[PDB]
Write a protein that binds this ligand. Structure first.
Ligand code: HEM
Length: 131
């Protein structure tokens, strides 16, 4: 099973069907996912956000966000890999990532041992050296 586009319905009210988010509220995923994936540790980070959530001040496309995102750990590993592959391809980000590797259920499964808080996920983000 696992249809990333269908699972994305759970994210769309915030990040939007076009992945552009809402400045001042929910960050964009379109365009931005490629930027994260280009960093070493970027794909793991995206999985951590889905498993553990995120909170804290971040900047995305030169705009500031200081909100909270819940964890989606209740989703199956296949579902998380599917929705992450969806946000990586729905708006063309994958083509923009040299050597893009699709997320897999096993990768997600492995990171379930981490047991992080949203603050630890922010600490992981800071190590990517984004903006
Ligand atoms: C749905 C399963 C869903 C996905 C997918 C998703 C992804 C996502 C990513 C990858 C980030 C990190 C962006 C970054 O620059 O680090 C992120 C961040 C936030 N999200 Fe999200 N998100 C999904 C669902 C939801 C839902 C339902 C909401 C709105 C209630 C939401 C909100 C946010 C917010 C806010 C952030 C930023 C958190 C911060 O520290 O400011 N997401 N999301």
């Amino acid at each position: 099973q696992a249809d990333g586009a269908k699972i994305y319905a759970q994210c769309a009210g915030c990040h939007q069907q076009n992945g552009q988010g809402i400045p001042g509220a929910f960050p964009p995923l379109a365009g931005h996912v490629a930027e994260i994936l280009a960093k070493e540790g970027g794909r793991e980070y995206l999985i951590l956000v889905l498993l553990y959530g995120l909170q804290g001040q971040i900047e995305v496309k030169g705009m500031k966000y200081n909100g909270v995102m819940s964890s989606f750990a209740q989703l199956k590993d296949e579902e998380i890999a599917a929705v992450l592959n969806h946000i990586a391809t729905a708006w063309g980000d994958a083509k923009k990532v040299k050597g893009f590797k699709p997320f897999t259920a096993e990768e997600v499964k492995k990171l379930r041992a981490k047991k992080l808080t949203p603050q630890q996920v922010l600490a992981e983000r800071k190590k990517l050296g984004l903006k």
